[PDB]
Amino acid sequence: RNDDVDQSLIIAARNIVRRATVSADPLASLLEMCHSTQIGGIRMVDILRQNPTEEQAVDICKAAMGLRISSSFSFGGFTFKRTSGSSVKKEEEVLTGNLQTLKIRVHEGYEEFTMVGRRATAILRKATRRLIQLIVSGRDQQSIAEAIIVAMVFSQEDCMIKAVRGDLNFVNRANQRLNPMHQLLRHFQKDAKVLFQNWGIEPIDNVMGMIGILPDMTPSTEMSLRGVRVSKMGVDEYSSTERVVVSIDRFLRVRDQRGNVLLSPEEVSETQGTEKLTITYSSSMMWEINGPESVLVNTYQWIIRNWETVKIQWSQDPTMLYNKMEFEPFQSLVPKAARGQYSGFVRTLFQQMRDVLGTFDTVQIIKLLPFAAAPPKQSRMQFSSLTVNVRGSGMRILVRGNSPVFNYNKATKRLTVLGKDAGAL
Numbered sequence: 001r002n003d004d005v006d007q008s009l010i011i012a013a014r015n016i017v018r019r020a021t022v023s024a025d026p027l028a029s030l031l032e033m034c035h036s037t038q039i040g041g042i043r044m045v046d047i048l049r050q051n052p053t054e055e056q057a058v059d060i061c062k063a064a065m066g067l068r069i070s071s072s073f074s075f076g077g078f079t080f081k082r083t084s085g086s087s088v089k090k091e092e093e094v095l096t097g098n099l100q101t102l103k104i105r106v107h108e109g110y111e112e113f114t115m116v117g118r119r120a121t122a123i124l125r126k127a128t129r130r131l132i133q134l135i136v137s138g139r140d141q142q143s144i145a146e147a148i149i150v151a152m153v154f155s156q157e158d159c160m161i162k163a164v165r166g167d168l169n170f171v172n173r174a175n176q177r178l179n180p181m182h183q184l185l186r187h188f189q190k191d192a193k194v195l196f197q198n199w200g201i202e203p204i205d206n207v208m209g210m211i212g213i214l215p216d217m218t219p220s221t222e223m224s225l226r227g228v229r230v231s232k233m234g235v236d237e238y239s240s241t242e243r244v245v246v247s248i249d250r251f252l253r254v255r256d257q258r259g260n261v262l263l264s265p266e267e268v269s270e271t272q273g274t275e276k277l278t279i280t281y282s283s284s285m286m287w288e289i290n291g292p293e294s295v296l297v298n299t300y301q302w303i304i305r306n307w308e309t310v311k312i313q314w315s316q317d318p319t320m321l322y323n324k325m326e327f328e329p330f331q332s333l334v335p336k337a338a339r340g341q342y343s344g345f346v347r348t349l350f351q352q353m354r355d356v357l358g359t360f361d362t363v364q365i366i367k368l369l370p371f372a373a374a375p376p377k378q379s380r381m382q383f384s385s386l387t388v389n390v391r392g393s394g395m396r397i398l399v400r401g402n403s404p405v406f407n408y409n410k411a412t413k414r415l416t417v418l419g420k421d422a423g424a425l
């Protein structure tokens with residue numbers, strides 16, 4: 001068991017899951033990236049089949065491949081393992097303190113859980129829309145507070161629902177609505193003042209180990225939030241991993257065999273580590289990961305590598321070449337006002353090249369072929385340059401001759417892109 005492999009697998013899995021959510025078919029995209037990614041020179045799919053690491057993004061990728069994962073679920077970034085009791089679901093409408101209706105499954109029954117996070121751990125005891133007890137420990141008061149918030153929302157208590165202020169319209173990267181329980185999570189994670197204010201306070205017995213925490217997140221030996229105790233000693237976070245068969249849908253929601261959602265992209269951490277082992281993504285969907293600059297380098301690199309393939313497709317079947325998925329990373333950098341505008345001008349420049357027969361440039365085709373990917377509109381033509389938006393600044397590529405973005409030295413026969421090299425012919 002290597003820590004560097006585990007750490008790097010998690011980073012690779014998160015990046016792929018985040019990118020996959022924006023796709024039209026997130027599951028198929030995620031599998032494509034998993035099969036075209038290597039970590040420490042080993043294929044990611046081989047690592048996933050051999051690695052026991054349980055983490056949300058990793059387990060989403062494992063699920064995609066039909067592998068077993070932990071039976072536990074993720075909620076608010078905490079791993080929830082049910083240690084006792086059970087519940088049944090009753091679908092209900094509840095009114096927030098903004099009078100927004102939320103359709104939720106109220107869980108009926110008594111249950112006990114451990115909650116395991118990176119900076120905090122807790123035992124949660126709970127009944128129908130009621131938090132009975134929360135024993136929590138963590139690195140600092142802010143980390144304890146994160147766990148408190150999640151448990152309050154998970155409880156589904158009335159006073160939590162009524163503590164909502166303003167409207168809940170949180171969305172993911174694909175502009176899809178978060179589900180109601182995640183609407184509540186994101187809301188109170190942003191600001192828990194009203195939640196903690198309305199929750200209630202109680203006096204506590206001065207027990208050895210246990211202390212209180214107040215609405216302002218400061219500790220107290222005298223009183224605490226209702227049901228909440230802070231363990232000075234860290235709460236026991238160990239258990240044996242029980243792996244089970246799971247299913248997964250188009251949008252990367254992973255379910256156990258009872259149909260309960262264990263994981264989704266909403267449960268994947270936003271934190272970005274620096275990998276200890278080299279991760280190499282070969283998919284074009286991942287060219288964005290190193291910024292807008294590497295997307296240009298990679299786009300032109302890919303054209304030069306597969307030029308004998310592109311040169312055959314360019315003459316015969318041009319519509320198949322324009323509708324490649326490899327030019328979509330380039331098209332995102334092109335300003336939205338001029339995507340169909342340049343797609344006409346450049347597609348007509350290739351039409352004159354085929355019709356006149358003796359105007360085949362090669363350097364002009366590779367330089368401009370990414371602009372022809374969008375749906376074409378009519379063109380005024382005679383453009384001095386074509387703008388491509390990098391980090392804030394809109395650096396432009398000239399039609400004839402070189403530029404800062406595209407610098408082809410004719411003597412060297414090597415293409416440079418924003419300083420860095422990008423293949424050769």
Ligand SMILES: CN1CN([C@@H]2O[C@H](COP(=O)(O)OP(=O)(O)OP(=O)(O)O)[C@@H](O)[C@H]2O)c2nc(N)[nH]c(=O)c21
Pocket residue numbers: 073074075082087089105106107111154155156179181182260261262
């Ligand atoms: C409030 N919850 C939420 N929950 C589980 O947490 C996971 C994520 O909940 P969610 O984001 O509301 O998804 P959803 O599909 O709506 O969950 P549900 O199963 O409640 O319909 C699900 O597996 C859900 O069953 C719970 N599981 C148990 N055992 N007891 C509970 O009180 C609750």
